[PDB]
């Protein structure tokens, strides 16, 4: 068929989840279901209808029109973006590898490990490992000596990430002592880290560049800022994931490069991602 099972994942502003109602989805939003559990000791649950909107949802809308396909959109319930646990993938990537979805649309980063088990479209927004600080702080990026050998400075920089994801894993592999150092400043989540930065309890927060650009774009008073794009570490992008050898990949790639070259992507960026600062 030209009718596709598509998985997504909530992460504002790329994918934003709302309730229905009248009890349907108003415009800007498309329907997306979520399998909600009865309790934490059963596999029983109920498919709840929700409404999805955002930067990546708009991408999906254009791809559907241009490449001509219909879809059932559903939200991942086990995992987030995609992690191989004991060689068993969860998250959005897991939905694709295990063929419950032919496509994953969202804030899904293109990386080498995932690219061995899924195909990725061209990237539709740039990302990487960036650094956010309070305005005035001087850091060049992840590979700054302030991060690689923190005790070379007095006092040592206080900096961390949100553990258990790609940032921690990348840092653990490239900068073993940095990882050892920064474990003590692990943040529970992105908003926690932003508050830590603004309250002077954290000097830098190391995270996904597109997310950090978006947060700094809309920061109140514009006090939190990121490094320049020239200093993002391990630059890559968000891309759409497809099954291995997918026949949709080529036309998705052409449509996405189309949107980039004709101004459509920049307009979505203006519509969803740019802010005051």
């Amino acid at each position: 068929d030209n009718h596709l099972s598509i998985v997504t994942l909530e992460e504002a502003p790329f994918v934003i989840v709302e309730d229905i109602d009248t009890e349907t989805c108003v415009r800007n939003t498309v329907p997306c279901r979520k399998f909600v559990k009865i309790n934490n000791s059963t596999n029983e649950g109920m498919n709840v209808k929700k409404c999805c909107k955002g930067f990546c949802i708009d991408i999906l809308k254009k791809l559907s029109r241009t490449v001509k396909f219909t879809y059932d959109l559903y939200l991942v319930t086990n995992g987030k973006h995609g992690k191989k646990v004991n060689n068993v993938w969860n998250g959005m990537i897991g939905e694709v590898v295990y063929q419950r979805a032919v496509m994953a649309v969202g804030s899904l980063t293109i990386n080498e490990e995932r690219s061995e088990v899924v195909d990725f479209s061209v990237p539709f927004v740039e990302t990487g490992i960036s650094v956010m600080v309070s305005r005035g702080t001087q850091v060049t990026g992840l590979s700054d000596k302030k991060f690689q050998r923190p005790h070379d400075y007095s006092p040592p920089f206080r900096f961390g990430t949100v553990p258990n994801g790609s940032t921690e894993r990348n840092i653990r592999n490239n900068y073993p002592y940095m990882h050892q150092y920064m474990t003590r400043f692990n943040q529970r989540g992105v908003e926690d880290a932003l508050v830590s930065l603004k309250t002077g309890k954290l000097d830098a927060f190391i995270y996904d560049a597109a997310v950090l650009n978006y947060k700094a774009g809309r920061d109140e008073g514009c006090k939190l800022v990121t490094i320049g794009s020239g200093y993002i570490f391990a630059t890559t992008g968000y891309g759409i994931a497809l099954q291995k050898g997918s026949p949709w990949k080529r036309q998705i790639d052409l449509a996405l490069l189309q949107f980039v070259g004709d101004g459509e992507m920049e307009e979505l960026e203006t519509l969803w991602l740019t802010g005051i600062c």
Partner: protein
Amino acid sequence: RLKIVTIHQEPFVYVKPTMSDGTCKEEFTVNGDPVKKVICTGPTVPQCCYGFCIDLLIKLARTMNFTYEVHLVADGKFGTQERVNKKEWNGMMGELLSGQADMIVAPLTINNERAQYIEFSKPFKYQGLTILVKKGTRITGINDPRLRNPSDKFIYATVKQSSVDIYFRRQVELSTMYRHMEKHNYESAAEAIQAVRDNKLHAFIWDSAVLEFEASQKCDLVTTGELFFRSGFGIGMRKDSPWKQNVSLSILKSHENGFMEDLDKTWVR
């Protein structure tokens, strides 16, 4: 033995004379790393090639265990599709499609027009388009009276038969700029940069990876400091080429490695 085509484009590809015995001058970087050089034939004569893309080629060759010979694109262009009625690509695009090359290893912009016909890797460099002027010229960027109301008092151009040529020609909204541009475009970025330094050219619309490097090295030049369009460089292969998959994995691993950041530090910053 893969046939690799490339193009002169500092800091991504330097092209230097060989020594008298046909070998290449052995150099190290200011920070003590060896400057890897490969012989590249080009318009007829062997020369020495090194830079960001050459380091990239060498890493790729070693990762996937292949040998290569490097040549410079015969007609000096990146590649656009022209009317012959049939159509043909010029530049490196044409060489790759005809079999003169098996792979383009160059600051080759990924776009929809080229992706119709060849395979790109995942981007090895993320950058965009900016504008280079001479110190003492004060424009505001892509939107500025002397650019959107062009005249012969302020000449601005890009490189003939490039992705930037493609970009300005395909969009009805850029028709006025393209009309002024196509009557001034240059054969190569080097000539257009040396034209700004000579004051014959007033603004140069080109890849930020190149232009920002030109400013950092030449005090008499400066860019807008603003990207007005974002784009990436990819390795170019023919359709369904059996290298495409591992080239991409290798590019991704090299971003995640820090290797691409090392090249950026060595060559760009």
